[PDB]
Structures are given as structure tokens and as C-alpha cells.
Amino acid sequence: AEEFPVPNGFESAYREVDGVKLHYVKGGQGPLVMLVHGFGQTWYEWHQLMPELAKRFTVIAPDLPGLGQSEPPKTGYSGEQVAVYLHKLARQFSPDRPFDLVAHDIGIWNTYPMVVKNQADIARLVYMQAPIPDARIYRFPAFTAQGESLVWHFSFFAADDRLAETLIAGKERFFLEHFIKSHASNTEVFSERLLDLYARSYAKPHSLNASFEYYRALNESVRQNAELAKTRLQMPTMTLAGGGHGGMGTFQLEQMKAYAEDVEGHVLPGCGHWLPEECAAPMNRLVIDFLSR
Amino acid sequence: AEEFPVPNGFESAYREVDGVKLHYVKGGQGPLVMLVHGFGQTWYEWHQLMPELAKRFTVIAPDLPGLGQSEPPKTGYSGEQVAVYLHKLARQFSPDRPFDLVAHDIGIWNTYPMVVKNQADIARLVYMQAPIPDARIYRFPAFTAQGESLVWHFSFFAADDRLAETLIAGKERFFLEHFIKSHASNTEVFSERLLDLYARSYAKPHSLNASFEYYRALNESVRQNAELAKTRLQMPTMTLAGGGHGGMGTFQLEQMKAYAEDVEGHVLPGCGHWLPEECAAPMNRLVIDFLSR
Ligand SMILES: *[C@H](C/C=C\CC)[C@H](O)C/C=C\C/C=C\C/C=C\C/C=C\CCC(=O)O
Ligand SMILES: *[C@H](C/C=C\CC)[C@H](O)C/C=C\C/C=C\C/C=C\C/C=C\CCC(=O)O
Numbered sequence: 159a160e161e162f163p164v165p166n167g168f169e170s171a172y173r174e175v176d177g178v179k180l181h182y183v184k185g186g187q188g189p190l191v192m193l194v195h196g197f198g199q200t201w202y203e204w205h206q207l208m209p210e211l212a213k214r215f216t217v218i219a220p221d222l223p224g225l226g227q228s229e230p231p232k233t234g235y236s237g238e239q240v241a242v243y244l245h246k247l248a249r250q251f252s253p254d255r256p257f258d259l260v261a262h263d264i265g266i267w268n269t270y271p272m273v274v275k276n277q278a279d280i281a282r283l284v285y286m287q288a289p290i291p292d293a294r295i296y297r298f299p300a301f302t303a304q305g306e307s308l309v310w311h312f313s314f315f316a317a318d319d320r321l322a323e324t325l326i327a328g329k330e331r332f333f334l335e336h337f338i339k340s341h342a343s344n345t346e347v348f349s350e351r352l353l354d355l356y357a358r359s360y361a362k363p364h365s366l367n368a369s370f371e372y373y374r375a376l377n378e379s380v381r382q383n384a385e386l387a388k389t390r391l392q393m394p395t396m397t398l399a400g401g402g403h404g405g406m407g408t409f410q411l412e413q414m415k416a417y418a419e420d421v422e423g424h425v426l427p428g429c430g431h432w433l434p435e436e437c438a439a440p441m442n443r444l445v446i447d448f449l450s451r
Numbered sequence: 452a453e454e455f456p457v458p459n460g461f462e463s464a465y466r467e468v469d470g471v472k473l474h475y476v477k478g479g480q481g482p483l484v485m486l487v488h489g490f491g492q493t494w495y496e497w498h499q500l501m502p503e504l505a506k507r508f509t510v511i512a513p514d515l516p517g518l519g520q521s522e523p524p525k526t527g528y529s530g531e532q533v534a535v536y537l538h539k540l541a542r543q544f545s546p547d548r549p550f551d552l553v554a555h556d557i558g559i560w561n562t563y564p565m566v567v568k569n570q571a572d573i574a575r576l577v578y579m580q581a582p583i584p585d586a587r588i589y590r591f592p593a594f595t596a597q598g599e600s601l602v603w604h605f606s607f608f609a610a611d612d613r614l615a616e617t618l619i620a621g622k623e624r625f626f627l628e629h630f631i632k633s634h635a636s637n638t639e640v641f642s643e644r645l646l647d648l649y650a651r652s653y654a655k656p657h658s659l660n661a662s663f664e665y666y667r668a669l670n671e672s673v674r675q676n677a678e679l680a681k682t683r684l685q686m687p688t689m690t691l692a693g694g695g696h697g698g699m700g701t702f703q704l705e706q707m708k709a710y711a712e713d714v715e716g717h718v719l720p721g722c723g724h725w726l727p728e729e730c731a732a733p734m735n736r737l738v739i740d741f742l743s744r
Binding site: 299306325332 | 595610
């Protein structure tokens with residue numbers, strides 16, 4: 159049984175990494191690129207970009223531990239702990255060469271530590287629509303004069319006594335449509351059919367809980383990154399952000415400049431958080447062009 | 452039936468104000484003091500203060516429109532609209548002399564406009580544990596280095612799609628215990644029975660919705676207060692705030708200094724947000740002494 163349709167020419171498979179069975183979808187030939195999804199979604203957010211990349215790269219899209227069809231982590235949900243699983247997974251398929259990395263939303267949180275600790279393994283890096291966890295997140299406002307705070311879900315999801323799982327259980331499809339559309343500019347791409355697929359996956363009880371454990375570990379991840387960030391990233395990096403409702407605008411690039419020596423950034427107008435779906439054509443073009451250099 | 456026990460010597464009653472049937476509890480003799488409750492609670496949060504105050508004053512504690520046993524407003528939930536109902540209710544009982552006002556949490560939001568517009572009607576003012584809605588609220592951080600913030604509920608409650616009602620329905624007692632304890636220093640003062648009573652009141656579907664409509668109107672109240680605040684408050688004012696977890700500390704007095712010419716403030720160590728319950732004895736003493744001068 160597959161939660162999402164595999165593109166033609168790709169395989170759905172599993173690999174045990176440090177005692178955790180990870181699900182992934184893989185296709186193509188050539189140097190490896192790993193695509194890492196974020197909250198509310200799975201490998202499937204990449205399914206339009208994957209066939210295009212697979213024309214010249216080997217492409218792997220895993221499900222984050224506990225999400226999609228991947229088992230929960232055995233160590234923990236902090237960025238440094240999860241990053242181990244993803245780094246070892248990639249190195250099973252690229253043991254002798256650097257690989258490229260694309261990450262969205264908490265995919266950034268779950269990859270930054272292995273990038274900074276294994277810089278020679280990362281050829282090129284693309285990050286979109288999430289802050290790297292650091293002290294900047296403690297200044298984001300809870301409440302805005304216009305639109306909506308992009309950030310109040312940090313506290314909701316991190317609240318103790320399983321607040322979020324307890325309130326959302328039984329209402330998963332409702333909640334997912336609300337939080338996806340509230341963070342989108344081009345809401346019309348989120349058909350009821352597509353929302354059904356995403357909701358069915360994260361409504362699995364262990365996946366609902368896993369989703370929020372990433373936020374419960376966020377303060378730990380901030381403390382981890384305070385040490386890791388004493389070394390800047392050296393490899394070519396590109397940031398993408400939406401310029402519309404739900405987009406991070408100029409923050410994505412401006413923060414990355416503190417972390418990276420070689421970075422270019424783009425803000426996609428009329429696009430919110432969910433760039434692969436809201437703005438597939440320009441986003442795919444930017445990623446393919448950047449990795450094809 | 453009554454949702455909460457009425458103290459001896461007090462009456463539970465109703466008055467029509469602008470076509471809206473308001474519930475209140477009233478007792479005592481002498482000049483009028485109106486006590487206005489906040490979110491999650493009803494008139495009952497004042498039940499320990501009321502018998503003491505009624506030795507020197509006529510005391511009235513209404514349920515906010517839509518909450519407790521009061522009918523929802525027929526105009527709207529912004530501060531200026533709700534303050535009309537509370538001002539006219541007070542004037543029914545004190546038509547010939549100014550009255551005192553004590554307000555907690557969103558009771559502040561729902562009274563500040565009628566105080567500033569009807570200053571000759573207000574003898575003395577006591578405000579505790581909430582910002583006056585203004586641009587200062589756009590600074591409060593969404594997330595803290597210790598976990599969930601005190602203010603992310605602004606955005607949870609203001610969200611559309613009836614987000615809060617939909618997620619909290621069926622879990623009203625669970626959610627109320629969470630937000631009471633997350634804003635408390637002294638959780639021991641909240642019996643399981645007291646939490647049961649508050650939860651059963653705000654779980655009423657029109658009351659659960661009314662609770663969050665105050666927040667859906669918050670930005671409108673900010674915009675209203677931007678104009679109203681061009682007129683400073685001239686009556687004697689006291690602020691109170693908790694010094695412990697859940698307390699606003701020095702913010703309460705420091706903001707009030709920008710609104711009021713004649714203000715004194717106290718911060719109560721060992722107390723959080725729920726001052727009438729967490730710190731009943733010192734809070735009652737400070738209020739009684741301030742109003743008795
Ligand atoms: C995934 C969000 C997906 C769905 C929400 C339910 C991650 O949790 C969050 C990723 C991105 C948004 C988070 C924070 C936004 C980052 C910066 C805020 C924008 C400008 C900052 C302005 C300032 O300095 O205050
Ligand atoms: C009622 C809060 C009641 C229940 C919480 C669901 C109002 O919505 C909020 C009023 C007071 C809540 C207490 C503290 C937060 C309010 C303002 C923040 C002021 C200063 C910052 C202090 C801090 O965050 O440490």
C-alpha cells in the first residue's frame with residue numbers, strides 16, 4: 159500500500175538506518191540529489207520536480223522519521239538527531255561522492271546539522287521556507303496587524319501535555335486544509351483530492367504525534383545550532399522564499415547570509431509557503447538550473 | 452438553574468440593554484462598583500471579592516455578552532461596541548453619580564472605550580492582567596526559549612474557519628485546564644470542580660464562539676483605540692499584575708502610564724494571570740483600599 163502515487167519510472171522502497179525503517183521514493187541516474195519535505199506533507203510535495211531532476215540526477219525523496227511511511231526516530235526529534243538518519247541514508251546511495259540537498263520547512267531543521275558537520279559530503283544546497291533554528295525565532299511576533307503570524311504554530315505544536323494532538327485528533331483533515339491554505343498565496347492548487355491524500359498520511363496517530371515532536375525539540379535544536387554555527391557553510395547555496403501570503407520574503411536570504419559564504423536568494427512573487435505546488439514552474443526552473451551548474 | 456453559586460446576600464438577575472439580555476450578580480449598598488471578568492471565566496471569578504466589597508459599595512458583576520448567562524451582542528465584539536452595553540448597564544444602576552470599574556483580561560478591552568469616552572461617569576479605575584489593545588501587542592513574541600508563549604492564543608483565537616471552536620469542541624474541559632495552568636503560577640487554587648464549572652459554561656456553543664469573537668475583533672479594537680487614546684484618562688487609576696509565571700510584570704503599569712495621568716501600580720510576587728483566584732487575599736486588599744480612599 160502506498161500513501162501517494164509514485165511517478166512513472168520511480169520506485170517506492172525502504173531502508174533501515176540505525177534501526178529506523180525509512181521510506182523513500184527514488185529514480186533517475188547520475189549524481190545524487192536528496193529532497194527533504196516539511197511539516198504537513200511527505201515526499202510527495204516533490205513529485206512534479208522529481209521527473210525533471212531525474213533526467214540528469216539520481217533523485218531520492220525520503221519521508222521524515224515518523225511521517226509519511228517512515229518509522230519514528232529512536233534517538234529523538236532534534237535537528238542533530240534526525241540529521242544523522244538523513245545523512246546516513248544519502249550516503250548509502252552516494253558513499254564515494256558528494257550529493258546535493260534540497261529542503262523545505264522543517265526539512266531545513268532536520269538537515270542543517272549534517273550539512274555543517276559533513277560539508278565535504280554536500281555539493282550544492284537549496285533551502286526554502288524555514289528559518290534555521292536560532293535565537294531569531296524568539297523575536298517573531300505572536301500576532302500581526304495584517305494577515306496572520308506565520309509563527310504562532312510553534313507554540314501550539316510545542317505545548318506540553320500533548321495539547322495539539324489532543325485537540326486535532328478526529329479533526330485532522332479540517333486542520334490540514336486550514337493551515338495549508340492560511341500559509342498559501344495560490345490556494346487554488348490545494349484541491350480537496352490533494353488535501354485528502356496529505357490528511358490521510360498525517361492523521362496516522364504516530365504521525366500526528368511525530369509531527370509535533372519536531373516542534374517540542376525546537377529549543378533543543380536552537381541550542382545545538384548555537385554551537386554548530388561557529389563554522390559557516392562553504393558550499394554553493396541557494397535560498398527560495400515566497401513573496402506572497404505565507405512567504406518569508408527577504409528573511410530567508412538575509413538569515414542564510416549569516417550561515418553561508420556563497421549564497422544567492424530568490425523571492426517568488428505571488429507565492430506563499432508551499433512553493434513546489436503554488437509556483438511549480440518558476441520554482442522547478444530555479445532548482446534545476448542551480449543544481450545543473 | 453445557575454451556572455455558578457451566588458454568594459449570600461447577592462441576587463442573580465437580568466437586564467435588557469440595547470436589545471441584549473445581560474446577566475449579572477448584584478449585592479451591597481452604597482456607590483456602584485462594576486467588576487468585569489475575562490476570557491475563560493464569568494462573573495464568578497469575582498465571588499470572593501464581592502462580599503467584602505459589598506460592605507461599602509453596591510457591587511455588580513455582569514457576564515460579558517455571549518459568555519456566562521448573557522446573550523451575545525447584537526452589534527459586534529469590538530471594544531467600542533461591547534463597552535456600550537457595559538456602560539449602559541452600569542448607568543441603569545448608577546444614573547446620578549460616577550461609578551468604579553474593576554476589569555480583568557478582556558474585561559479591559561471591553562471597557563476602555565466607554566471609560567475614555569465617558570470620563571465623568573467613572574470615579575476610579577482598576578485594571579489587571581491585560582494589555583489595552585494597541586500597537587504594543589504586535590511585539591509580543593510567538594515562541595520562547597522555554598516553550599509556548601503567553602500570547603500565541605491571540606492568533607489561535609483570531610483565526611478564521613472557526614478554527615478554535617472546531618478544535619476545542621469535545622475537549623473544552625481539557626483545553627481550559629491547559630490554558631488556566633499555562634497562565635498560572637498557583638495551580639493549586641483551581642480545584643477540579645472549579646475547572647468543571649468554568650468549562651461547562653464556556654462549552655455552550657454560543658459561548659465558545661463568543662469567546663473567540665472577542666479575539667477576531669482585536670485588530671479592529673486596536674484601530675479604534677488608536678483614535679480614542681488621543682484623550683488621556685484623568686480619573687484615579689490602579690493597575691495590578693502578577694509577578695510569577697503567567698503574570699505581565701511591569702508591562703501593565705508601564706503601558707497604563709501612557710494612557711492615564713494619575714496611576715499607581717503593583718506587581719504581586721508568586722501570582723500569575725488569575726489574580727482573583729491565585730492571590731485572592733492581597734488582590735482583594737489592594738482593590739478594597741484603593742476604592743475606599
Ligand atoms: C513549517 C510551516 C508550515 C506549516 C505551518 C502550520 C515550519 O513550521 C515553519 C516554516 C516557515 C515559517 C516560520 C517562520 C517564518 C520565518 C520568519 C518570519 C518572517 C519574517 C520575520 C520578521 C521578524 O523579524 O519578525
Ligand atoms: C486573556 C488571557 C487569558 C487566558 C489565556 C488563554 C487575554 O487574552 C490576555 C491577557 C493576559 C495574558 C497574560 C500574559 C500575556 C499578555 C500580555 C504580554 C505582556 C507582557 C509580556 C510578558 C511575557 O510574555 O513574559
